[PDB]
Structures are given as C-alpha cells and as structure tokens.
C-alpha cells in the first residue's frame with residue numbers, strides 16, 4: 001500500500017486557515033458541551049483514533065483514507081463517544097465541501113490543541129478519501145486495563161518509541177473518561193480544557209488509590225477527585241517511562257516541543273509526500289489574528 005498525498009485542487013494556505021478559523025470559532029461558541037469542558041478534548045481524541053489504526057507492516061489504516069465516515073469504523077466500541085466530535089465537524093464540512101475527510105479530522109485535532117493554548121502543530125494537507133472496503137477492522141486501538149509492557153508493544157505497531165509514547169500520553173490531562181463510553185469515570189486533573197504538563201505533575205505528586213468503579217473496572221483514584229487509567233499509571237511503574245515522566249513534569253517547554261513532533265508524526269503516518277508538495281502549514285490561532 002502506497003498512499004500519496006494530493007493537494008485538494010487549487011487550494012493553498014489561505015483556504016486551510018479559513019477551515020481552521022471556522023473550527024476554532026465554533027469551539028468558542030458551543031462552549032457548554034460536557035459540563036462546560038467544550039469540544040476541544042473530544043476533537044483531539046478523534047484525530048488520534050482515526051490515525052491510531054495505522055499498521056507500519058502493511059501500511060493499512062491511518063488518517064489518509066478518512067474511513068471513520070463508514071459504519072464499521074464509526075461503530076467500533078473503542079470509538080464510543082467520538083460521534084460527538086463528528087457531529088461538531090459536520091456543519092464545517094458542509095461549509096467547505098472541497099476538504100477531504102482525513103484532512104478535516106486531522107485539522108480538527110490540530111485546531112483544538114492550539115486553541116486550548118498548546119504548542120503549534122505543523123500540519124500538511126492532501127489526504128484522499130478511499131472506498132468503504134479500505135476501512136480497517138475493529139480491534140486496532142489499545143485497551144485501558146493493561147501494563148507498561150502492553151503500551152510499549154502496542155506503540156511499536158505505530159512506530160512510536162518510549163519518548164514519543166510518554167509525550168503523546170500527556171494529552172490525558174485533557175477532558176475526561178466517561179463511564180457510559182469506556183467503563184471508566186473521571187478527569188485526570190484540574191485544568192481539562194487548557195493544554196499544560198499537568199498529567200505528569202499529577203502522576204508524580206498525587207496519592208493514588210486502586211479502586212473499583214461502577215462498571216466493575218479498576219482505576220487509580222486520588223483524594224483530589226482525579227483518576228488515572230491502569231495504562232496511565234504504568235508510566236511511573238516502568239523505569240524507562242518514569243524518567244521521561246519526570247523530565248516533562250520538570251520542563252513544560254520540552255514537553256510542548258516533543259508533543260508537537262509526535263502528534264504531527266501520528267497524523268502523517270503512512271502518507272507519502274511528493275517533493276513538489278507544499279511545506280507544512282503553521283496556523284495562526286484566533287488570538288494572534290485578533291478574532
């Protein structure tokens with residue numbers, strides 16, 4: 001499988017900045033979703049789940065084909081709750097019908113991080129919608145009830161090393177787990193719609209307690225009202241992971257710089273860019289535009 005990126009006909013930077021601004025403006029307007037957390041968190045989980053199906057061995061899955069629009073990927077149990085991010089994006093796609101699906105779900109992920117004050121993420125266009133039969137089967141996204149060894153092994157298939165895995169996991173500071181979507185309940189911190197290095201700090205400074213929740217699943221709870229998944233707490237159990245968790249807890253600027261690189265790579269995995277292709281775009285936030 002070779003997937004060559006092809007720029008949407010005649011489009012350039014200015015066209016994708018209007019799609020970015022349209023997404024950002026609605027993030028600001030529908031601010032009441034999920035008890036005022038808003039849509040930013042579910043939009044970065046959607047961009048990670050449409051890219052997380054990639055397999056490095058035969059180049060199937062990944063964000064290129066925009067196949068989350070088909071029944072099989074959209075009804076995946078692992079994607080429970082992301083229907084809310086899709087529904088948020090469906091009026092922006094009506095307004096900009098020329099944008100491809102893979103491009104709109106990955107650009108919604110980029111827009112949410114930056115609007116929630118994270119790092120700039122360089123983004124490249126050119127994903128092309130592929131047919132229903134190119135949709136990956138269910139079962140390629142990770143389980144939550146597992147340990148460090150499982151996380152390390154799982155992220156090998158997306159070829160992410162340890163440093164890239166721990167940076168990517170810092171997004172678990174955003175939003176929350178929802179019992180009816182995943183069988184886990186609660187937020188991982190105080191500031192869940194602002195992008196910070198809070199996840200690492202909470203992991204190292206809270207007193208965590210192994211409890212059983214209402215869906216019979218075990219999770220790590222703190223007196224402050226925060227929770228960690230078994231797969232999140234794995235990060236301080238493993239020696240390799242623990243020293244990278246400590247580096248990002250002590251340096252937010254290195255964490256932003258490493259999350260930006262690993263998140264762009266996640267979104268671009270499996271796509272070939274021709275050398276006549278445009279350079280990555282860096283979009284201005286509503287704030288830098290005075291909007």
Ligand code: HEM
Nearest residue numbers: 041042045048142143144168171174175176177178181182
């Ligand atoms: C071992 C890897 C991972 C596992 C097992 C995992 C699991 C989960 C689970 C169980 C939820 C709760 C969903 C719900 O109930 O609504 C969740 C939410 C979320 N995860 Fe992950 N995750 C993993 C990696 C990542 C990565 C790599 C990213 C992003 C780059 C990410 C971003 C998010 C975000 C932002 C949410 C919040 C969604 C919301 O508030 O609706 N996850 N994760």
